[PDB]
Design a protein around this nucleic acid. Structure first.
Ligand SMILES: [Mg+2]
Ligand SMILES: [Mg+2]
Lengths: 87, 91
DNA sequence: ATAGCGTCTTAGCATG
DNA sequence: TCATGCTAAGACGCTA
C-alpha cells in the first residue's frame, strides 16, 4: 500500500498500455488501479471521479471510433516522458 | 508558440477593457480568444493557468454578483501597472 | 461539461 | 566551489 508518485494521467496511461487491445473502458481502468495500487481502497470515494475528469479533459486520452478509451497518437510520447519525469 | 503577453497581463487587459471593470472567468476567456486567436486551437491547459493566476495573485480580487466576478484590487493596481510598463512583453 | 485552487518544474537572482 | 532561499512564471492536475 505505497503512495503512487504518479498523477492520474500516468495511472490511466499504464492501465491502457497493459491492455491487450491498447484500449479500456472506464470500468477496467478502475480495476487496474485498485489491483496494482491497493492504496485507493482507503482513499476517499472521490478518486474514481478524478480519473474520469482526467480521462475527459486531457489531450492524451480519446475515445475509439460504456465506450472505450485509448491513447492519443499525437501526445503519446508526452505520457512516456511524463512517467520518466515523475518525482 | 505563446503570445508575448503574460497571463497576468492578459487578465489585466481583459478586465480594464470592460465597462464595469469586473468580469467572470468565462468572459475573460472570450476577451483573450477574440484578441488573441492563438488560444482557439491551443492546448486546453491555458484556461487552467488563467484561473490559477486569478487565485494566486493578490492583485486580482474576488467580488460577488454560476461562478463569481473578478476585479483588480485598487491598492495593488499601480504596482501591477509599473510591473507591466517595466516588462510589457514576456513570452 | 465549469470554476476554484492545487502540484510540480524552471529560471534568474539572491543570501548563507 | 557548494547549498539554500526568493520570486515570478507556467504546463498540467485535482476537487467539488
Ligand atoms: Mg480526453
Ligand atoms: Mg487573487
Amino acid at each position: 500500500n505505497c503512495k503512487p508518485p504518479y498523477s492520474f494521467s500516468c495511472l490511466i496511461f499504464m492501465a491502457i498500455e497493459d491492455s491487450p487491445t491498447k484500449r479500456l473502458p472506464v470500468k477496467d481502468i478502475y480495476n487496474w488501479i485498485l489491483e496494482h495500487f491497493p492504496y485507493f481502497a482507503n482513499a476517499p470515494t472521490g478518486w474514481k471521479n478524478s480519473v474520469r475528469h482526467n480521462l475527459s479533459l486531457n489531450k492524451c486520452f480519446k475515445k475509439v471510433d460504456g465506450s472505450l478509451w485509448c491513447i492519443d497518437p499525437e501526445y503519446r510520447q508526452n505520457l512516456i516522458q511524463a512517467l520518466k519525469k515523475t518525482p
